[PDB]
Ligand binder design. Structure first.
Ligand SMILES: CS(=O)(=O)NCCc1ccc(F)cc1
Length: 119
């Protein structure tokens, strides 16, 4: 029932994501010099360095907010892809599965801790 435990759990999951080769296209903001269809199709860019810096700045109140930003990395990749078979999009699907598999307990524990706090 530790209401704060999610933050270090998210830091460690981000470390695992950065070690994963599938995170390479998503570690830093998309290069607008390399990708021109970018801001015309993506309204809210997101990447893992931005997520890590928001977390480290104390600018996430809950792991749900972090999850929303990580899910935006994946939905931006899906919206920008010219094909479901593209390399970057295929990497995003595997990385998303890995992320969802690991964030599930973080979210469950935090929501349970908050329910206990408010009992
Ligand atoms: C940091 S980068 O060197 O510009 N690589 C970005 C690859 C990418 C391009 C479009 C997307 F929707 C998602 C990822």
């Amino acid at each position: 029932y530790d209401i704060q435990a999610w933050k270090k759990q998210c830091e460690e999951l981000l470390n695992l994501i950065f070690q994963c080769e599938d995170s390479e296209p998503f570690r830093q903001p998309v290069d607008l010099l390399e990708y021109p269809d970018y801001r015309d199709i993506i309204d809210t860019p997101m990447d893992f360095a931005t997520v890590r810096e928001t977390l480290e700045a104390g600018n996430y109140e809950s792991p749900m907010e972090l999850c929303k930003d990580v899910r935006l990395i994946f939905s931006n990749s899906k919206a920008y892809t010219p094909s479901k078979r593209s390399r970057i999009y295929s990497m995003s699907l595997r990385l998303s599965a890995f992320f969802e598999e690991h964030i599930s307990s973080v979210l469950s524990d935090y929501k349970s801790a908050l329910r206990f706090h408010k009992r």
